[PDB]
Write a new protein. Structure first.
Ligand SMILES: [Zn+2]
Lengths: 113, 243, 97, 135, 246, 101, 42, 149
């Protein structure tokens, strides 16, 4: 399994959470909750709703440029399984999380000086 | 009296009570029941029970993961209910005289009586039910700080959701995870029973491999499994600098 | 005269009367049949229902379409602190039960 | 063999008898009006209903005049009523749509416009072969 | 070396199998008979992978590849991608792609040298095909069908196309591909060639319903078995074909 | 005013989205597919008068030039100028990306 | 269809109980009884 | 020539490339050395269907999908591969050259700590803020008296 993200607001979408809309052009829209789904059906722009990660990025209230944001990607070329690689990846995930947290706090203080 | 049980009796049951003080319940009075000892001879049963006097028995020394059990409980009470929800009858058409959530004919033929087979309004729910063939997915240990962690999800977390179980509290003891639903409601005493017969299905012989357990909040549309995850997603708050 | 269209009966007669239970704790009506060749064991336990949650299960069920796939299933959590054994009741067999 | 396919898990049926759905193939029909559902059981007052991957019997209300006088078998490929798959996903399409087939399941047309459901594509291999998008 | 087979009483072999010159992919079923057909023919010469794509069993019409690479659609899960990567050796490049037309077995048909695609694929998908598969890519329709992968079976030996493909289209497409082409059918007149069969340079598996004349046409065009060539069709087989398909 | 405002949010009353409108504006093949999805003889004005921005058919050239002065058309122009919300913007909002080699 | 009370269904279930589910439940009973005897003798 | 005859001529026609060239084929060498599988031979290869029949038949036999995994170390093929860790996807972070980027991140982090990126920083100001809070409280009390009267 995997953790998806809400199309509308950007929250983590876990299994059995939310609803998916399948459109006839071939695009699928995963929503984490009925709030996001109903706003989407009402044709509201997520970029103008201030509780969404889209608005927060467009307003510059999320840390968008950082070295720690380059480690997570949709890997479309699979890697042959390697136990050592997976354990060093888990250690990397912990260290990246800590460094990202401290840099985010610095970014917030520079916003709120 | 122990010798009398040894020489005259064919069925031996222990008396056992819950430790309700380890639960979040406001109730302080424990629940007591007779539990039958099966297997062995009657003398063996008597030594077994006498050796088990004043001792705590955990759930995993009676039941095991990948086993089907029976759950016996009293169901959710609904009070006095009409025939439409009590029996599932068809609603009469709109603006029917003297009521449409009713049965039109209750006694249209002989005898000159109302028959016991006719749907009538009355008490619905709070019935005793015995439901069978419920698979145990996990017997989690209360002293395990990651008893909701799996082999593919390495997040160290307990079974209790964020904010606790709604109207129950936190599960700090050993717990049983059962596929599906059970007859009772929250806070209610459940009786778990061994199956009376040998099973005939492959589902009873299947081995359960959990990949993930949801621990998001059930007080709303919870999207986070842990408070650390919630902090990591949200970022720094105003009260974080104020503190 | 006869009913023109057949329809099965609403509800089951195996659960009558539809009345409140006479006790709040569920009653074990039957225990498993005792085999003296098996080792000694307890046939029941008690717990308290805490609520429900969701899992993802890796399914090995040969023949099913969801074989070797992940399935999302609802589960019930029952909080089970250990019980304490404090007694012993003996039963004799009589022509009245 | 009757038209009901085997090995189908339970899903929500969004299209009862009397529903008009779109025609997703180039057979010439524009809509399909459902008159019956294959495999529908017997129940007093209950409308037979179909879901994605079911074969129904339908008449053509809009389309070529040669198609208007017959009862065609069709397979529902898209529905708008949300339903759950075994992986826990609740989902729906933006329209209800089906394709005309024969009783053995081969399509009357040659191409499918728009996506098809996984249930329809898995139960009917000809629809799988003529589907450009499977969702 | 043409073998008649069935996947759970279905004659559409190409829907449930993908066969190249370096690996075979078979849909996971409730039995091992469909895998065992390919296992009896390909006696461990190339790997056979039992795989699931997007939770479905239509992997043949959802996947496309050759002896150099494999392309899977965007709805493939990470564990399915990992299973494919662990099952295939490192000589084969596996990529998950973001093409809107996710039925890659319908929109892409390819051999080890060239590939034909549905005319509406994205440009980025076109260079991804040309990079991972290492082939040259052309946008083509076969007998006015845009689903070239389901309406054509292609190998390095030759190709079998839709039975209603005109002579001019056969010559143009044969000049484009560099292989001889024959317009023929499978499964008693089914024109879905790609869904009806899978073929590589030394083996073809067609449905059990496929008759002896069209099976012999397949063997001639794909050069399977001793003394098999496309020249036998219009010389030694012409009477049989005219008698059968008139 | 909106006709039958109670059932406006049903799936059977759904309108074309702004991202599809952007694709129709940038590429005529997408618009041609959307128009082949419809039947020209049942369209207002035989399909000859169509506003791509509003994704809407009109009965006459006078009617189309008429709606262009109205505020619904101008709100559609403003929303297209701002840009529709899409999956790549949604991915950038969380700082996620695609590694294609 | 054969009913749940059919004799052939009962015989099939009896063979399943004797040959398949029986040893599995026997081993599980041995493990559980060993644990609860460990508590009883403790 | 009628349409049906045109169709059968189209079926018998064999198209060929105009240049006369042919594509290189990639039949592996072991194909010639393969022996043909036949059922009557007592020395057959044991097939997957034979193993299934020996282990309960169809619907009972559980196939092992990890048996044919080609891995660097053969005892890794039955490992439980991690997928979720602390609300993140492991497969998103799987990168073959992870150690170089993690070393670069650590070098950047120590550089920033040296430069003072994470370095964190008046009684008169505190008194003036406290007096302002007192004034705001008095204003609230005045407004409450007005709302009462
Ligand atoms: Zn959301």
């Amino acid at each position: 399994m995997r953790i998806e993200n809400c199309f509308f607001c950007g929250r983590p979408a876990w299994p059995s959470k939310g609803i998916t809309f399948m459109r006839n052009d071939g695009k699928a829209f995963r929503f984490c909750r009925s709030k996001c789904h109903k706003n989407f059906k009402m044709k509201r722009n997520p970029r103008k709703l201030k509780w969404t990660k889209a608005y927060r990025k467009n307003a510059g209230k999320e840390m968008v440029v950082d070295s720690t944001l380059q480690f997570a990607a949709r890997r479309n070329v699979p890697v042959r399984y390697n136990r050592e690689l997976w354990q060093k990846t888990l250690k990397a995930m912990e260290r990246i999380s800590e460094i990202r947290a401290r840099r985010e706090r610095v970014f917030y203080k520079k916003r709120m000086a | 009296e122990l010798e009398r049980i040894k020489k005259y009796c064919t069925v031996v049951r222990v008396l056992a009570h819950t430790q309700i003080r380890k639960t979040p319940l406001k109730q302080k009075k424990a629940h007591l029941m007779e539990i039958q000892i099966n297997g062995g001879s009657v003398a063996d049963k008597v030594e077994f029970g006498r050796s088990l006097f004043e001792k705590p028995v955990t759930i995993d020394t009676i039941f095991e993961k990948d086993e089907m059990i029976d759950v016996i409980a009293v169901t959710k009470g609904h009070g006095f209910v009409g025939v439409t929800a009590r029996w599932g009858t068809k609603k009469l058409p709109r603006k029917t005289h003297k009521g449409l959530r009713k049965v039109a004919c209750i006694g249209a033929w002989h005898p000159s009586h109302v028959q016991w087979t006719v749907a009538r309004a009355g008490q619905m729910g709070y019935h005793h039910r015995t439901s069978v063939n419920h698979k145990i997915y996990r017997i989690g240990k209360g002293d395990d700080e990651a008893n909701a962690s799996t082999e593919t999800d390495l997040t160290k977390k307990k079974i209790t959701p964020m904010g606790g179980f709604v109207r129950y509290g936190e599960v700090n003891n050993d717990y049983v995870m059962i596929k599906g639903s059970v007859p009772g409601v929250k806070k209610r005493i459940m009786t778990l029973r061994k199956s009376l017969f040998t099973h005939t299905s492959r589902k009873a012989l299947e081995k359960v491999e959990l990949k993930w357990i949801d621990t998001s909040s059930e007080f709303g549309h919870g999207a986070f499994q842990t408070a650390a995850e919630k902090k990591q997603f949200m970022g720094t708050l105003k009260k974080d600098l104020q503190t | 005269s006869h009913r023109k269209y057949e329809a099965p009966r609403h509800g089951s007669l195996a659960f009558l009367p539809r009345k409140r239970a006479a006790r709040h704790r569920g009653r074990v009506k039957s225990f498993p049949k005792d085999d003296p060749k098996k080792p000694v064991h307890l046939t029941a336990a008690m717990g308290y229902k805490a609520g429900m949650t969701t899992i993802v299960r890796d399914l090995d069920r040969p023949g099913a379409k969801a074989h070797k796939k992940e399935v999302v299933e609802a589960v019930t959590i029952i909080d089970c602190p250990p019980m304490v054994v404090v007694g012993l009741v003996g039963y004799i067999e009589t022509p009245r039960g | 063999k009757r038209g009901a396919p085997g090995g189908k898990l339970k899903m929500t049926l969004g299209l009862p008898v009397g529903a008009i759905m779109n025609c997703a193939d180039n057979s010439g029909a524009r809509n399909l009006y459902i008159i019956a559902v294959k495999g529908a059981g017997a129940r007093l007052n209950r409308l037979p209903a179909g879901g994605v991957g079911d074969m129904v019997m339908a008449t053509v209300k809009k389309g070529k005049p040669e198609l208007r006088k017959k009862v065609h078998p069709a397979v529902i490929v898209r529905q708008a009523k949300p339903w759950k798959r075994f992986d826990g996903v609740f989902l729906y399409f933006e329209d209800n749509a089906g394709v005309i087939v024969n009783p053995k399941g081969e399509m009357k047309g040659s191409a499918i416009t728009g996506p098809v459901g996984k249930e329809a594509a898995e139960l009917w291999p000809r629809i799988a072969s003529n589907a450009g998008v499977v969702m | 070396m043409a073998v008649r087979a069935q996947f759970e009483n279905s004659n559409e072999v190409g829907v449930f199998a993908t066969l190249t010159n370096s690996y075979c992919l078979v849909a996971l079923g409730a039995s091992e008979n469909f895998y065992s057909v390919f296992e009896a023919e390909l006696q461990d010469v190339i790997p056979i992978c039992r795989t699931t794509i997007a939770g479905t069993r239509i992997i043949g019409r959802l996947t496309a590849g050759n002896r150099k690479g494999l392309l899977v659609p965007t709805t493939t899960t990470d564990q399915e991608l990992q299973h494919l990567r662990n099952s295939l050796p490192d000589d084969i490049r596996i990529q998950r792609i973001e093409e809107r037309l996710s039925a890659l077995g319908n929109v892409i048909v390819c051999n080890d040298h060239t590939a034909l695609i549905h005319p509406d694929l994205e440009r980025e998908t076109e260079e991804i095909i040309a990079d991972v598969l290492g082939v040259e890519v052309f946008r083509q329709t076969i007998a006015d069908h845009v689903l070239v992968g389901s309406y054509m079976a292609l190998s390095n030996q030759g190709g079998l196309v839709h039975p209603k493909t005109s002579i001019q289209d056969q010559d143009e497409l044969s000049s484009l591909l560099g292989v001889p082409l024959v317009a023929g059918s499978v499964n008693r007149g089914s024109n879905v060639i790609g869904g009806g069969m899978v073929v590589n340079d030394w083996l073809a598996v067609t449905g059990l319903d496929t008759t002896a004349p069209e099976l012999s046409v397949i063997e001639s065009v794909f050069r399977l078995g001793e003394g098999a060539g496309p020249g036998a069709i219009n010389t030694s087989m012409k009477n049989t074909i005219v008698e059968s398909f008139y | 005013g909106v006709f039958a405002k109670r059932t406006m949010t049903k799936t059977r009353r759904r309108l074309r989205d702004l991202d599809q409108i952007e694709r129709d504006l940038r590429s005529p093949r997408h618009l041609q597919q959307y128009k082949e999805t419809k039947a020209a003889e049942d369209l207002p004005g035989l399909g000859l008068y169509y506003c791509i921005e509003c994704a809407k058919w009109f009965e006459s050239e006078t009617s189309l030039v008429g709606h262009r002065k109205g505020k619904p058309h101008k709100r559609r122009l403003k929303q297209l100028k701002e840009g529709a919300y899409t999956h790549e913007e949604a991915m950038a909002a969380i700082g996620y990306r695609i590694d294609n080699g | 269809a054969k009913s749940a009370r059919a004799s052939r269904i009962k015989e099939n279930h009896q063979r399943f109980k004797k040959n398949i589910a029986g040893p599995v439940e026997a081993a599980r009973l041995e493990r559980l009884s060993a644990k609860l005897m460990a508590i009883a003798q403790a | 020539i009628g349409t049906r005859l045109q169709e059968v001529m189209a079926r018998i026609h064999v198209a060929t490339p105009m240049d006369g060239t042919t594509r290189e084929t990639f039949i592996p060498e072991a194909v010639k050395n393969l022996k043909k599988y036949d059922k009557n031979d007592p020395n057959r290869r044991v097939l997957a269907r034979d193993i299934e029949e020996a282990n309960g038949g169809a619907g009972v036999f559980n196939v092992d999908l990890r048996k044919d995994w080609i891995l660097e170390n053969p005892e890794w093929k039955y490992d439980k591969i991690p997928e979720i860790f602390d609300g993140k996807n492991v497969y998103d972070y799987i990168d073959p050259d992870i150690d170089a980027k993690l070393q670069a991140l650590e070098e950047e982090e120590e550089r920033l700590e040296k430069e003072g990126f994470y370095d964190e920083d008046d009684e008169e100001e505190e008194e003036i803020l406290q007096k302002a809070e007192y004034i705001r409280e008095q204003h609230a009390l005045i407004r409450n008296e007005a709302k009462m009267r």
